[PDB]
Structure formats: structure tokens, C-alpha cells
Design a protein around this nucleic acid. Structure first.
Lengths: 50, 201, 117, 132, 139
RNA sequence: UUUGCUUCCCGGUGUCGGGAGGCAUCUCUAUCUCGUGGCAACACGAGAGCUUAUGCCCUAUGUAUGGCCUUGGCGUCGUAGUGAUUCUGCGACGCUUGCCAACGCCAGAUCACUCUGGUUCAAUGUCGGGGCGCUAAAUCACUUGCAUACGACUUGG
RNA sequence: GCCUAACUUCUCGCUCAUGAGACCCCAUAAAAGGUGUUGGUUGAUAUUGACAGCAAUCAACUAGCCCUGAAAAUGGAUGGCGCUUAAGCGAGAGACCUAUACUCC
RNA sequence: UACGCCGACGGCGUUGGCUGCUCGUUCUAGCCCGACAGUGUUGCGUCUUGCUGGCGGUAGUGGGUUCGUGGCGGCUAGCGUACGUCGGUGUGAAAGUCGACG
């Protein structure tokens, strides 16, 4: 139905989304992390928890 | 004779083969058909007859490679779909294009949860003599391998509760509308005369 | 400005080309079979005997027929209902050219003329 | 559970077949399927009909087994079966359908206009009631 | 020889046009033209914009409604030659003939107690609605 | 994807097909509906071919002026609810929408029908202008050995 | 009934089979059985109250449907799907479909 | 205007298909009347009212069945042209439109 990720994800956890992590810009979850410290993002996260 | 929309048919209290033949004729003639509550369709004869027939059907598998053999679908919707398929020239382009216009479901999906369904009186089980046993495709599917009987039952119960609430509200509003017409009588008396004279009330 | 009593609805009866005259292993494409909307007897089907019918289809090349203002992709095949077929209200029809089999289940317009009411 | 029964004197309404839309009186029962009925005052001859074509009404006449046409007619006009049947919604619906089937194009236009005006007014009153 | 007129077709009857740009219009029938045999009809051009022209009886439904047409006096120059086909443009002559023929018809419609419904009927176009099967409809 | 690009709107332009609108309880079939009394079972009273989907809505000239009635539809936005993801209710704001004087008055015509609803509707592709808006990855080659005939698989920069 | 052009058309019966039956040649079935059900034949008892327990009954037969008799090897065949007041079995009725056959052109 | 290439609506010829009325013809009643016999019988017993059966009548009334070297209609099809009424297109190219093949 939905998935909620932690605000801070370990670098080794984010590596799993990559095949060339070192060569990439490491942008995974960068925008999602900002939702937790945002008014609308917090509302969406709370709605997902509900 | 084509219908503009798809034909939504409530599968409850319908005879499997008769409904399948009617739906196959419609599909061949060019309409789209949606069948709801496929688990509520019935087959005449005691349960043991249908159960043993389905077991014999299950026994039909390719000796060399069962992944090639007959595919025995257990869900009521797929059972009805295959029964209709049997009544079509599905090995030809005509039959394939006709069969691809059929959708059979267990329960009422949210898409159709808010529409009026039809019945085929010529396929109702109440044409059987009262002293004649009949099985339910839901029970047959459960006993031959269907894994979602309870889930569909719970969802259908919730749907029925919501529909009952909606119908109570609708009854209230219909009483209100009758009262409103009664009140409007003085203004509409001029037109009600014409309506009744032409026989419409 | 509104054209002072414009069109309000269809002026034809809906029908579907259900197939050609046939046995089981034979087929005569010179005659077509149509199923009409609201017709359920040969008695009712006989009312439409002699009425013209049309099949409209879409083609690639656009044509600007005289009497039209815009080039159109739609062409027509004309025909006429000849007699009822069977007991359940189907009709037999004959078209200027044999109906293409691609018209199976597609709309056929049964016009109300030549009128005799 | 069953109130109306196939009994001598029961008034039946011919639902389908030869004399469709008329009333007759049961004067005999031949077997479980065939019943001899005679509607002399409703323009129905003494005949045998399948029960599959008949529908039971609420009127029962005080007849005798195999009552002749004279007696059944006397009972029919005595009981006034036709007036009472015409009083019922059963007959009102039939008369309404008969009027409906014979409407002309002009009458259809008039009906459409009057019906839409009535519907508009009734909707206004329904809105009034809903606001309260 | 001339074509035989359908029995239901008499002067003043309202017909439904079945073909052409005016299909579905309710017009009023004046008389059968002698030469061609077509129908000189004119739904009063004021109401439904149907001018004074001809139409074959094969493309009309003769309804039971009949408007009083005894008062209209058709000019003698209106005939098959008058209507014979020559960018068309309506002529100031055609305008005068339309008004001359239509005026008594409009007066007769007005005097009818049902003039409201009559004007509305002539101004509305016929169509097939839901569950409306021509073989069961009494026109 | 620092040029490229998502999304929305405006315009071209290709390709493609369809061919007259809308409608929500269930359960039950050797009983059902309404009203009342009942926790419930049930009871009383009045009805019941049942053809209310064989139905019901909708169903068309344009100002103006005067008299009515203010309802219904559509779009955006905001909250509240609905999980079998869309759909609902409530507003608020916009664009409209009914009848009478009254066919009172203007306009309407293409010659008799041949694909126009007399520009029918949908789906998508691409090219140009704008409005917010974003600034990535695989892959080869090396490497790893839990893997491997070759591809493939598991690692790192 | 749908494959499949032509009726879920009309009338009366019979049949429930834990895979019934379903149309010349034709694509297997018998002897013998059933207190399943439906009709008939014969002989008795019974209202001077017939059988069971402290108002019809009894007995022997007969023939329709159904059941037992009825076991083979790749998974499979009334042609298939399916069909149970049938879409089965028997007697029938209207209409309808369809040949390179018949009539006419 | 005529003519060519195509369509529509009428007329006529031919072969039809479906569907009604109306006269009669054959064999026959029932309703109606009379006596007798019976009884699935209402109301209060060689009662009565019903009802049935043949039998005898048929004046009047009067339906079934059968078809005719009968009479009068309604809708509509294919083919051909006693033939009419008319539309599309074609008369320098070209484009479009129309026609035929495909």
C-alpha cells in the first residue's frame, strides 16, 4: 500500500540502489530526505502512516 | 443492436452455461461484457458432480510437460471466462477479438461498485425445479484451490454495509421527493392534467 | 447564431452487420444479415423491408464531396433491406457492393426512407 | 402463503394467447394443467385453456360445477366483476399502456413539454424541502 | 402519368422530412405538383426556416396532425418550372412568395387554441429517443 | 541529463478508429411492500401479475423590455471522507440554466436525398510559442570470487 | 443454446445417475438383479370397519426411465463448451435455416 | 441543350415473398324446446336448484371443418427497361470531382 523511509539513510543502504555508486552523483533519496523537514512533506508522511 | 456502454451483469443466481452462452453471443455480436460476483454463479446438480468433473478436468495435463498442458484456473472469474471461451471460435481471430472483450470478476470492483447491474431471466437458477440441488462456483473454486474466498467475502460484506447505508439515505430522499411533488401539486396541476390524459402519471 | 430548430438526435435505427448468408461450411457474400435495435420478430422485421441502409467507414485519403465544406475521411456503402431473416427479428440486406467482413459488429444506419407509413 | 387458488368460480385474466387482456370465470378443472373457462360477458367463449396462459385475480364467483354460460353470465353481472377489476391498479396500468401505445407525434411533443415543466417545478419544491 | 398520392397525405397535413439538410423538420403540406408529382410543402419559413420548395413523398412521414390550410391561396406562377433548378442565392421574389403563402397558415395556427404547442411542434425537429422503435410508434 | 527535459496551456501538422445522452442496496423465490406495535421472534391493519429497465430523467431560434421561479448543470479551488484509487459530501468563487407577453420582432433559404450532427467524436505522434519546474543514470574497460562453457552472477574505484 | 445460418418457440409426460443421457451405417455389451420411480395385468381382504401399534391394504407378475452387473495402460472426448419443469428420453405443433437439387431470369 | 460514366425516386414487364378481409361450398353442431335416465350438486330427500347423457325436435339464433375454374385489398424483393422525374461528374490544362479496376 505504501512505504515510508527514514529521514536519514546510511550511505551503504543507498548504495543498493546503484551499480556505479562511486561514478554517480549519489542523488538517491536526496529530495525525499527534505520532505521530513517540510510542512507538506510531513503531512504526506503522516498521511502514509495513517 | 449494439449497446453504447459495456453490459454489467450481476452473476448471482445465474446458471453457468446459459449465462455463458448469452454472454458469448453478445461478445461475438460486438458488445463488451463485465460480469460481477462470478463466485455467486451456480451450476445445477449436487456438489459432488461438479467437484468430480473439475477433478477430471484437472487430470488433463500434458505428460511431456505440464507447463504446456491445460491450464486449470481455480478462480470463479477465470472459470466463467473459460466456460465462455469454450463457446467461442477462440482459435480464430474473430473468437480471440470477441473473447478479449470479456471481464469476469469475483465481487464488485470499486470501478463498478457504483453502477446498476443487469440479469438474464432466461439464465436464472429459479428455472430449475425446487427439488434440484445446485452448487455454487465459489464453493467449487474454494474446494479446487481458490485461495481468496474469505478476502472476497469480507470485502463484499463491507460493500453491502455501505450499500445498505446508501439505500437508507435514498429511501429517505425518495419519501422527501414524494412529499415535494405533493406540495407542488397546486403549481403542476396544469401539466399533470396533460400527463394523465396521455397516460403517464 | 443558433440555426432556428437545429438537429436534436438520430434519424436512423441502429443495426449491426452480424455476417453474411451462410450454411455451416458455405457463405454467400452477396447477401448480408443485420440485427436491428428493438426488433424481435419477423413481424417487426417486415416493417423495415425496403428501407435504405448505409455503412460509414473511415479511409486514409480525404475527399471533398460537392455539397460539403470540408474534406472528410469518411466514405459510405449504400444498401437496402430485402426481407426478414428467421424468427428473432434479423433482416437480410443487399448492398451496392458486398459488405466488407471488417464491418462485423460495426454500426449500420437503417434510414426511414423510402417511407410508406 | 397462497391466497388465490384455482377454484370453480375464480375469475382469471388471460395473460397471453388467443383472448389476451380479457377476464373469464373458471367453470371446470380438467387436470392440473387444463381448465375450462367461459367469459360470456367479457367476450370469451367457453373453452379449455392451459393454466400457463392464465393469471388469477382476486374475484371469486359463487358458481356451480360446470355452470352453463347463462349462469356464469348472470353471476358475472351480479358480482360486477368488470367494474371492480377496472378499479384495480392491474387494469389501470393496462389502460395506461393502451393509451401510451397509440400516442401520435404531436401528443408525444405535448407530453414531453408538460413532463419537463412538471419535473422542473417538482425539483424546485424538492430543493425547498431538502433545505429544511 | 403522375405518381399516386398516399392516402394519409391530404392538404394541410404535417409531414416529417426524412432526408436532406432539413431532415427531421416538421413541415406543412400544400399540394401535389402536377407535372413532376412531387409535394409542394412549406413548413412556415418563419418558424422552422424551411422555405417553399418541393419534396418527394418517398422522403416524408405523413403525421395525423392537420393544420387548417383552406385559407392559403397559392399564386399561379408557383409550379415545377418555378422550382426547377437553374452559388445559389435566395431571390427577392422567392421571399415574397414565401410570405404570401405562409401568412394565412400562420394566422390559422395562431387561431388554434393549441397555437402554443403547434408553434413549438413546427419549430422542433423529430428524432428517435431511448426505447423508441419506429415499427411501434404511431405517427 | 546545464544543454537537455517532466507537466499545463496555446497553435500548427501527421497517423489513426468509432458512429446519438444519464441511472448504485442487499437477502429471498412455497411470499413481498407500506403503516403501527415490538430487544428479538414476530403480530395486527391495508394491499399486491409484480409490465417502475416493458421504467425514470434529459430532449434545442437571438437579443432586448416587463412579469414570475430561483432551481439544475459544468469548471477551479479548500477543507472532510472513501483504499478492492479513484470516487464522493460540504462549501466559496466563476460560466451558464427555466416559464409567461410571445413566434411579439430580426435571422434562417444552397433548388428533391445520396459521408456531415450539414465543421460529429475519440486516441495518440511530431513540430513551434509560452507558465511554473529538475539538473540523472546505465554500459564498456579494469577489479573482486561466494559465480562462471561464452553470456550471465557477486564486488570496488 | 453458443461454436454455427435457423426458437433458450408451443403442448403432454418420464428421468437424478459420487462424471446420467444425447440420433441409420457407427464406432461393444450380456445372463442375472433393485422394497428407486412411473404406468399396467391378475388374485385376494376390507366399511357384518382391511395391514402396523400396544381407509384402503396384501401378494405375484409385467415394462418405461434410472442404478448394480461394467477392469488397461501419454491427458481426452454425445465433435467441444456446456445442459437437469434440459440444450436428455418419447409422442406431437407452428415457424425458421440451408445444396452444384427444383422453378424462373 | 444533347451525349458519355455513375446513383436516387416513380411507371411498366417478369419471377416472386409476407399479410389481411369478404362471399359461398362439403360434413356438422351448440344456444333454444320436450320426455326419460343419471348425479362431482346450491337452498331448505319419489324435494328443489344445478349439472350430465344420449333420444326426439329446429322455428329463430348460430359457431367449427372443407375447399372454390371465387371477389376485394396492404407491404415489399431480384432481374429487365411500354419509359419518365431528377441529381452528381466530363468538353484547353493542371488540381479537385466522378467512374472502373485493384
Amino acid at each position: 500500500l505504501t512505504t515510508i523511509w527514514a529521514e536519514h539513510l546510511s550511505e551503504e543502504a543507498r548504495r543498493r540502489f546503484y551499480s556505479n555508486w562511486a561514478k554517480s552523483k549519489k542523488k538517491a533519496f536526496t529530495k525525499y530526505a527534505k520532505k521530513w523537514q517540510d510542512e507538506d512533506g510531513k503531512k504526506l508522511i503522516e498521511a502514509d502512516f495513517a | 443492436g449494439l449497446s453504447n456502454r459495456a453490459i454489467i451483469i450481476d452473476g448471482k443466481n445465474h446458471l453457468l452455461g446459459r449465462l455463458a452462452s448469452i454472454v458469448a453471443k453478445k461478445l461475438l455480436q460486438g458488445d463488451k461484457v463485465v460480469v460481477l460476483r462470478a463466485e455467486e454463479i451456480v451450476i445445477s446438480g449436487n456438489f459432488h458432480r461438479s467437484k468430480l468433473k473439475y477433478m477430471s478436468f484437472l487430470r488433463k495435463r500434458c505428460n511431456i510437460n505440464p507447463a504446456r498442458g491445460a491450464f486449470h484456473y481455480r478462480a470463479p472469474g477465470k472459470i466463467f471466462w473459460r466456460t465462455v471461451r469454450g463457446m467461442l471460435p477462440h482459435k480464430t481471430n474473430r473468437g480471440n477479438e470477441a473473447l478479449k472483450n470479456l471481464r469476469a470478476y469475483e465481487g464488485v470492483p470499486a470501478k463498478y461498485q457504483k453502477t446498476k447491474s443487469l440479469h438474464a431471466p432466461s439464465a436464472s437458477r429459479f428455472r430449475l425445479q425446487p427439488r434440484r440441488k445446485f452448487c455454487v462456483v465459489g464453493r467449487l473454486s474454494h474446494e479446487v484451490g481458490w485461495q481468496f474466498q474469505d478476502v472476497v467475502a469480507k470485502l463484499e460484506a463491507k460493500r453491502k454495509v455501505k450499500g445498505a447505508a446508501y439505500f437508507e439515505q435514498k429511501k429517505k430522499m425518495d419519501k422527501l421527493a414524494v412529499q415535494a411533488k405533493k406540495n407542488a401539486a397546486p403549481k403542476i396541476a396544469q401539466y399533470q392534467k396533460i400527463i394523465e390524459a396521455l397516460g403517464y402519471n | 447564431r443558433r440555426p432556428s430548430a437545429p438537429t436534436t438526435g438520430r434519424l436512423y435505427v441502429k443495426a449491426i452487420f452480424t455476417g453474411f448468408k451462410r450454411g455451416l461450411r458455405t457463405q454467400s457474400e452477396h447477401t448480408s444479415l443485420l440485427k436491428l435495435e428493438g426488433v424481435f420478430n419477423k413481424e417487426d422485421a417486415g416493417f423495415y423491408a425496403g428501407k435504405r441502409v448505409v455503412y460509414l467507414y473511415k479511409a486514409h485519403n480525404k475527399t471533398l464531396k460537392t455539397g460539403h465544406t470540408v474534406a472528410t475521411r469518411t466514405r459510405a456503402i449504400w444498401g437496402k433491406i430485402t426481407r426478414p431473416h428467421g424468427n428473432a427479428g434479423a433482416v437480410r440486406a443487399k448492398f451496392h457492393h458486398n459488405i466488407p467482413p471488417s464491418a462485423l459488429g460495426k454500426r449500420i444506419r437503417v434510414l426511414l426512407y423510402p417511407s410508406n407509413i | 402463503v397462497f391466497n388465490r387458488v384455482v377454484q370453480i368460480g375464480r375469475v382469471v385474466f388471460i395473460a397471453s394467447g388467443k383472448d389476451q387482456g380479457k377476464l373469464a370465470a373458471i367453470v371446470n378443472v380438467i387436470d392440473g394443467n387444463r381448465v375450462q373457462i367461459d367469459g360470456p360477458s367479457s367476450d370469451v367463449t367457453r373453452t379449455v385453456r392451459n393454466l400457463k396462459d392464465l393469471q388469477l385475480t382476486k374475484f371469486v364467483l359463487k358458481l356451480r360445477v360446470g355452470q352453463r354460460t347463462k349462469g356464469v353470465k348472470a353471476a358475472f353481472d351480479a358480482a360486477k366483476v368488470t367494474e371492480n377489476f377496472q378499479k384495480t391498479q392491474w387494469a389501470k396500468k393496462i389502460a395506461q399502456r393502451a393509451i401510451r401505445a397509440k400516442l401520435t407525434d404531436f401528443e408525444r411533443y405535448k407530453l414531453m413539454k408538460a413532463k419537463q415543466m412538471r419535473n422542473r417545478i417538482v425539483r424546485v419544491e424538492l430543493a425547498k424541502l431538502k433545505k429544511a | 402519368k403522375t405518381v399516386t398520392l398516399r392516402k394519409t397525405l391530404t392538404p394541410g397535413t404535417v409531414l416529417i422530412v426524412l432526408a436532406g439538410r432539413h431532415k427531421g423538420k416538421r413541415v406543412v403540406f400544400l399540394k401535389q405538383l402536377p407535372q413532376s408529382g412531387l409535394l409542394l410543402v412549406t413548413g412556415p419559413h418563419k418558424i422552422n426556416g424551411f422555405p417553399l420548395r418541393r419534396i418527394g413523398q418517398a422522403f416524408v412521414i405523413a403525421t395525423s396532425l392537420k393544420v387548417n390550410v383552406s385559407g392559403v391561396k397559392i399564386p399561379e406562377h408557383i409550379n415545377d418550372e418555378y422550382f426547377k433548378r437553374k452559388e445559389y442565392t435566395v431571390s427577392e421574389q422567392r421571399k415574397k412568395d414565401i410570405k404570401t403563402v405562409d401568412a394565412p397558415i400562420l394566422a390559422a395556427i395562431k387561431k388554434h387554441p393549441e397555437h402554443k404547442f403547434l408553434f413549438g411542434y413546427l419549430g422542433t425537429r423529430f428524432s428517435l429517443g431511448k426505447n423508441q422503435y419506429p415499427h411501434k410508434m404511431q405517427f
